[PDB]
Chains A and B, each alone.
Chain A
Amino acid sequence: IKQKLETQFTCLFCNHDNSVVCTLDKKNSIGLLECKKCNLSFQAPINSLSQPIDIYSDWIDACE
């Protein structure tokens, strides 16, 4: 079951807080993120030990 998490993470690009959703897709070991203002999304494989913090950190690293 996909969970849509409106986590308190801020978006780097759109200068808005709480405009980031770090969705979880463990079925195919995939990461999804939805933004609310600039609507940007990040994709990355995720394992059993990965968590929205890990996805957010990997997103930050990718953006930089």
Chain B
Amino acid sequence: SFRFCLECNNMLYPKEDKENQRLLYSCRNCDYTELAEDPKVYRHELITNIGETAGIVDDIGQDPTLPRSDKECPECHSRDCVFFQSQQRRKDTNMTLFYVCLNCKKTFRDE
């Protein structure tokens, strides 16, 4: 979620403030610097589970090709809705089909 300045539009580089022992966020094409609300700088992981639910759309239901199921909807309690599995192309993707309703479209698992 990297951001820029509101008058220079260049990205903010976190440069340490040696004197005050505070983290700042200073650009380079301008002298506009602000406070650092959170000491986080860079965050990287190897066990990633992001993107499973990022494939949610509202036009899913109308599509006829989407299968039709008999599971119960905790929100609408309807008996005509579809379901789908995660859109992760990683080789470690599972078969936990993300059941979806036609009113709330909540992703919940029947495990």
A–B contact at 8 Å CB threshold (below): no
